[PDB]
Amino acid sequence: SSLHIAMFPWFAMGHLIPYLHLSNKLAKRGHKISFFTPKKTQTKLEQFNLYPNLITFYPLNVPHVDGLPFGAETTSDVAISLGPILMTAMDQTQNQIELLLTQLKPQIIFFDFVFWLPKITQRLGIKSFLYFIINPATISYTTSPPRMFEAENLTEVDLMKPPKGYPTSFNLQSHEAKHLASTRKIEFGSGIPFSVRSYNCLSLTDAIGFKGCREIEGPYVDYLQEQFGKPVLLSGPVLPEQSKTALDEKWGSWLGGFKDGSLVYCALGSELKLKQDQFHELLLGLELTGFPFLAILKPPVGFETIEDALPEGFKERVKEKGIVHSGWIQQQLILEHPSVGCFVTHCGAGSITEGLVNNCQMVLLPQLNGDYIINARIMGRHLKVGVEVKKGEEDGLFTKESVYEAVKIVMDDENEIGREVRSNHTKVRNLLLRHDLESSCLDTFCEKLQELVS
Ligand SMILES: O=c1c(O[C@@H]2OC[C@H](O)[C@H](O)[C@H]2O)c(-c2ccc(O)c(O)c2)oc2cc(O)cc(O)c12
Numbered sequence: 001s002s003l004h005i006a007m008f009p010w011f012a013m014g015h016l017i018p019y020l021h022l023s024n025k026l027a028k029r030g031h032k033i034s035f036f037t038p039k040k041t042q043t044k045l046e047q048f049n050l051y052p053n054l055i056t057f058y059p060l061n062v063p064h065v066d067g068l069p070f071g072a073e074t075t076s077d078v079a080i081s082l083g084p085i086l087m088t089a090m091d092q093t094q095n096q097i098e099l100l101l102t103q104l105k106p107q108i109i110f111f112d113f114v115f116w117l118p119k120i121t122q123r124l125g126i127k128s129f130l131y132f133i134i135n136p137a138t139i140s141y142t143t144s145p146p147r148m149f150e151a152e153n154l155t156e157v158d159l160m161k162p163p164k165g166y167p168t169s170f171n172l173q174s175h176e177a178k179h180l181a182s183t184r185k186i187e188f189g190s191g192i193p194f195s196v197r198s199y200n201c202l203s204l205t206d207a208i209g210f211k212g213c214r215e216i217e218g219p220y221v222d223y224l225q226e227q228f229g230k231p232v233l234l235s236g237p238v239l240p241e242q243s244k245t246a247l248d249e250k251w252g253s254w255l256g257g258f259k260d261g262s263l264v265y266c267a268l269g270s271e272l273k274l275k276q277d278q279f280h281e282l283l284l285g286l287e288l289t290g291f292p293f294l295a296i297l298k299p300p301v302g303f304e305t306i307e308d309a310l311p312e313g314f315k316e317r318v319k320e321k322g323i324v325h326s327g328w329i330q331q332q333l334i335l336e337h338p339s340v341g342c343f344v345t346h347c348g349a350g351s352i353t354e355g356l357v358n359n360c361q362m363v364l365l366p367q368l369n370g371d372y373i374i375n376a377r378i379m380g381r382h383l384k385v386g387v388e389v390k391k392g393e394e395d396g397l398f399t400k401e402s403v404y405e406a407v408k409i410v411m412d413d414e415n416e417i418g419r420e421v422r423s424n425h426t427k428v429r430n431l432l433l434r435h436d437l438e439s440s441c442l443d444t445f446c447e448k449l450q451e452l453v454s
């Protein structure tokens with residue numbers, strides 16, 4: 001029988017988009033989806049609703065919290081340092097969420113971050129499903145019980161090694177362990193420290209799920225199920241669905257002028273802004289390659305236009321071979337264009353999937369975020385599908401030569417490291433796109449959801 005599922009993702013495009021990709025896959029199997037979205041953001045999400053008779057959007061009014069920019073609805077509307085205030089605002093939708101659940105009466109609600117929800121749903125007879133689109137390797141490393149019981153005795157050197165029982169090995173740099181040790185304590189909404197919030201969600205929810213498949217994410221889901229003693233499900237890799245909007249003719253024509261496989265596409269997601277010096281180093285490193293490039297970047301910290309922050313003489317030298325562009329673009333459609341030979345990525349989980357299912361060589365430029373860093377280590381060292389740009393051990397900074405070097409390695413047909421990462425990326429793409437991989441993941445996923453509501 002068909003399920004009624006409500007979707008309540010975090011107010012971020014990197015959560016909204018994969019929740020909607022999965023919503024379409026569930027609706028294709030006959031399930032009814034009630035999709036909760038910030039009100040103004042709904043207009044930008046309609047292009048991804050392939051089953052409007054089964055997927056209905058329900059608008060949320062994102063309430064004011066002191067400090068929140070006016071009208072802001074997602075992390076693409078605020079600086080990263082303002083994220084905790086946007087999470088207080090999500091916490092404050094509780095009244096309109098409880099009204100929606102009593103009127104719509106779903107059997108299950110998928111959610112991010114709001115650890116007060118499982119108390120409401122248990123009262124209403126609804127099953128709570130904490131659904132992550134980040135890597136279970138990340139949650140396992142930072143938010144498993146052994147990490148939480150050290151409380152404030154958890155140090156940078158503690159975070160240099162994995163928690164007890166962790167299923168794999170990789171190395172963090174000093175500045176990365178420092179980042180994790182400090183940021184985990186910082187309040188993220190309504191006075192709740194960041195890792196405490198996610199631990200509360202894991203502890204109180206009825207069940208847990210992640211984007212991913214057994215072949216890659218399996219060992220981390222098994223570890224988390226052992227630790228938290230409740231079902232931890234896999235949705236499948238959430239392969240991107242096709243939009244109802246074709247590729248903007250402006251980009252289609254410009255991209256079409258380049259030889260197949262010759263262009264370097266660089267994008268660091270929709271949330272972050274580089275500092276000026278690393279913005280300069282990144283763009284000068286792309287220029288040094290001599291390849292055409294498209295860099296989708298916000299103006300660096302302190303600056304309001306790309307043009308004002310470009311290194312001196314950059315546009316005059318680069319001419320028509322390179323564009324640096326600040327607006328939202330159709331990334332998934334650009335990554336499918338045959339001109340693209342290389343993807344320089346911040347290692348967001350959504351961007352990683354979009355690169356893996358395409359042909360582009362992967363250059364890993366993780367920004368300072370636990371999931372980006374752990375994704376970069378798994379992609380660079382475990383799957384070995386990409387080359388990571390070297391950062392200073394203590395300062396976290398890269399040179400333009402290190403950017404140049406990584407792109408040159410993967411783009412050089414005669415470079416054996418480049419051939420190896422191409423060959424490994426091909427193996428991973430063939431797995432993810434295998435004719436029965438995603439469908440059998442979803443088969444299991446839906447059986448376990450049916451068990452959950454029985
Ligand atoms: O990047 C992280 C992340 O997602 C990001 O968290 C930070 C910002 O809010 C981003 O928009 C969001 O995508 C989340 C997260 C996502 C969804 C949830 O339901 C949840 O409980 C936690 O946990 C993390 C835990 C870490 O130890 C390290 C991380 O790096 C993240």
Ligand SMILES: O=c1ccn([C@@H]2O[C@H](COP(=O)(O)OP(=O)(O)O)[C@@H](O)[C@H]2O)c(=O)[nH]1
Pocket residue numbers: 012013014015017267268269270271272296327328329330331332347348349350351352354
């Ligand atoms: O200009 C942009 C920037 C991002 N994206 C999409 O936004 C999502 C970003 O999610 P990810 O986890 O990669 O990064 P984030 O933006 O959350 O840091 C992916 O689906 C990208 O294809 C897009 O379409 N256009």
